[PDB]
Amino acid sequence: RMLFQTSYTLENNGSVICIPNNGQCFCLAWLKSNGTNAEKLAANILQWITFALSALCLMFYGYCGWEEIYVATIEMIKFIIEYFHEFDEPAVIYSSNGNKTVWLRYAEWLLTCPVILIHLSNLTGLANDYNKRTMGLLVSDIGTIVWGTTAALSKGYVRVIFFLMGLCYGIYTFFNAAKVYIEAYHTVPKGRCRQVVTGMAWLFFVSWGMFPILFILGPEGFGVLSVYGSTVGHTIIDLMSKNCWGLLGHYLRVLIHEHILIHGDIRKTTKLNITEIEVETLVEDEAEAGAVSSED
Amino acid sequence: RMLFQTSYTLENNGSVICIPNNGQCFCLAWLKSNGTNAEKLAANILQWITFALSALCLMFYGYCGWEEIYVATIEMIKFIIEYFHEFDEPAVIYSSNGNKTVWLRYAEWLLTCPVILIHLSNLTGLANDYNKRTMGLLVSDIGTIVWGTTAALSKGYVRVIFFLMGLCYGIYTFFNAAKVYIEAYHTVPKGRCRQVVTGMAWLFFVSWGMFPILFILGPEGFGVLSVYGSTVGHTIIDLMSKNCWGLLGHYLRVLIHEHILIHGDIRKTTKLNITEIEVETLVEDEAEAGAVSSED
Ligand SMILES: *[C@@H]1O[C@H](CO)[C@@H](O[C@@H]2O[C@H](CO)[C@@H](O)[C@H](O)[C@H]2NC(C)=O)[C@H](O)[C@H]1NC(C)=O
Ligand SMILES: *[C@@H]1O[C@H](CO)[C@@H](O[C@@H]2O[C@H](CO)[C@@H](O)[C@H](O)[C@H]2NC(C)=O)[C@H](O)[C@H]1NC(C)=O
Ligand SMILES: CCCCCCCC/C=C/CCCCCCCC(=O)OC[C@H](O)CO
Ligand SMILES: CCCCCCCC/C=C/CCCCCCCC(=O)OC[C@H](O)CO
Ligand SMILES: *C\C=C(C)/C=C/C=C(C)/C=C/C1=C(C)CCCC1(C)C
Ligand SMILES: *C\C=C(C)/C=C/C=C(C)/C=C/C1=C(C)CCCC1(C)C
């Protein structure tokens, strides 16, 4: 099917390659198989199921709330492109050093990272304002993806360096994301809302932790995984990272706003020490509205 | 110098290209000259002068304030890479459809866009908090760059579509950036500070407006500009966009903080109508501290 040169002849006992003078790019590296038919079959099924979850989440959100819809919007447009041109440039970049770079993956990441990280900075949906910490999260995360994308396009020691630079930015991101979730947990009402925040923390760190793991394992790293293999891995953590997390988000938001509808905005002053942090604890009792220094 | 195949023989009256079977990538498209020696000379001079401004701004900032230093930090690291490997992959991506994509340019943009846009949302340096508008600026701007990078990697009608998607996100960004500058102007003290804000608005819209212009003019568009030609253009708007703007930023910040040191934080309530906006006008008179509905 390809729109680079696929047809060639070996000459002088395979010391010379002859190609038609048709102006097409040529590299043997590009023509390596993308994997087994079993890997491909598994990947096409998980993609449809991802399309289905993306489709149902959107209609569901149809019944504030912009971050979840957008990630499903970007996710559906992703599947229509995958369906028609998953292995066409520039969904994959076939480059001069022989690399295959899945631009489709990294593009989606850069697009939605501020959406996800704004949503991280707005779990309750009650804030109209964002602290200095939000801004450090966005700067560090975008650096991470830019270094990582550079690492995927590179080879040898240059790939190693950009990966290392991605990891250092990433560590700063994970550290600060942890404090946000801690604050969120002690902010929301004591019941179901704290189960959902806990659910979102698990989904976030496991799914986000799996991306640098799949980088090292894929063609961009030590080439352990095939391309279809990588796609299957990506579909699973994609479902967790995007659809499910925003669905849990929307659910949390509903619970919090309904708390204001029934009990009202009854905040507290839980002074944490996990340092010298502070928090506004929503409670279901009007009585409870004082300073609770819970030094952790 | 190149690390793709540069040496080939024409066979059967130029209907066949023969290349050594050494596993190197090959495309005639990659081997087109990057421009005249005059263009190259001009580009190397402006780069050194950019290195010099980046170097002096950093030492100058050495005598809160993190956004300006970082853009100069990223800018210096950029020049050391340019000096050694400006036309080596992945500073340039040479891809299977024959495109040259200046990844070095787009990477820097993605890295510093949250830094610049946070700084846009913090001209005075007095805010500890960021409004909902900041977040829309970051989402729209990152979309713009991701669509544009996709457009640069693509060809034909797919390049047209991604450019159009970049422009639509871009328009939303420019619209909202305009409101920020309006708010900033009517927030800062009446004297020198409003000259600097006005200076920053001009630099921002002219420099940022010139990027989609240089895209359309370069190899990524209608190929009017050569590669060295594009580099020269980029150096000029780079100096404006990064060094100069952050220097004017730092200067503004100094002026505002010194206002708190002399007069103190004396805010007002200028209710604008350019809609139904509001602003906290810093003044040098303790007397002045009331609601001034200045409907524009
Ligand atoms: C054609 O080139 C091939 C290179 O593979 C040569 O085949 C091999 O020759 C070397 C001997 O120098 C052996 O070590 C290998 O075991 C051979 N086979 C393979 C599969 O590598 C072959 O000798 C060359 N023929 C001519 C006429 O030069
Ligand atoms: C070698 O191929 C070239 C293709 O350029 C042929 O040269 C041209 O031939 C056509 C005639 O069909 C003319 O229209 C052009 O003006 C010729 N010159 C150029 C520079 O394009 C040439 O005929 C071929 N030779 C053989 C033996 O097939
Ligand atoms: C914050 C979450 C915690 C979890 C974070 C996950 C840690 C994964 C890192 C592994 C280090 C090993 C080095 C990896 C270097 C990758 C670059 C590479 O593959 O290099 C190609 C090689 O040079 C040519 O074959
Ligand atoms: C907000 C600031 C205001 C200023 C904003 C600047 C506007 C520039 C747009 C021009 C439209 C013309 C169409 C440009 C399409 C670019 C894609 C392209 O070059 O297409 C390649 C072609 O298909 C193969 O040769
Ligand atoms: C589409 C949704 C999500 C959540 C995408 C997330 C991507 C990452 C978390 C990537 C992380 C990286 C790290 C931490 C370091 C190596 C380079 C990566 C970009 C792969
Ligand atoms: C390094 C500093 C700056 C300010 C870089 C800015 C880059 C842009 C403003 C790019 C804008 C684009 C637009 C508006 C639409 C087409 C695609 C572009 C990414 C080139």
Query: Rounded distance, CA B147 to CA A228, Å?
Result: 25
Cβ within 8 Å, pair B89-A96 = yes
Residue of A nearest to B102 (CA): A150
A75: its two tokens: 């996710």
Q: Resolution, rounded to a tenth of an Å?
A: 2.5
Cβ within 8 Å, pair B139-A114 = yes
**C-beta B209 within 6 A of ligand 4:** yes
- What is residue A175's DSSP assignment? H
Cβ within 8 Å, pair B129-A131 = yes
Interface size, chain A vs chain B, as Cβ–Cβ contacts under 8 Å = 166
Could you write out the three-class secondary structure of chain B?
A: CCCCCCCCEEECCCCEEEEECCCCCECHHHHCCCCCHHHHHHHHHHHHHHHHHHHHHHHHHCCCCHHHHHHHHHHHHHHHHHHHHCCCCCCCEEECCCCEECHHHHHHHHHHHHHHHHHHCCCCCCCCCECHHHHHHHHHHHHHHHHHHHHHHCCHHHHHHHHHHHHHHHHHHHHHHHHHHHHHHHHCCCCHHHHHHHHHHHHHHHHHHHHHHHHHHCCCCCCCCCHHHHHHHHHHHHHHHHHHHHHHHHHHHHHHHHHHHHCCCCCCECCCCCCCCCCCCCCCCCCCCCECCCCC
Nearest CB to A107; choose among B16, B23, B150: B150
Residue of B nearest to A150 (CA): B90
Cβ within 8 Å, pair B153-A129 = no
Of A216, A225, A237, the one to substitute when testing ligand 3's pocket (max ligand atoms within 8 A of C-beta) is: A216
Distance of CA B38 to the CA centre of its chain: 26
A22 CA to chain B: closest CA distance, Å? 8
As a residue count, chain A comes to 296
- What is residue A268's DSSP assignment? -
**C-beta B183 within 6 A of ligand 6:** no
**C-beta B75 within 6 A of ligand 6:** no
CB-based burial of residue A179 (10 Å sphere; 0-12 exposed, 13-18 middle, 19+ buried)? middle
Cβ within 8 Å, pair A153-B93 = yes
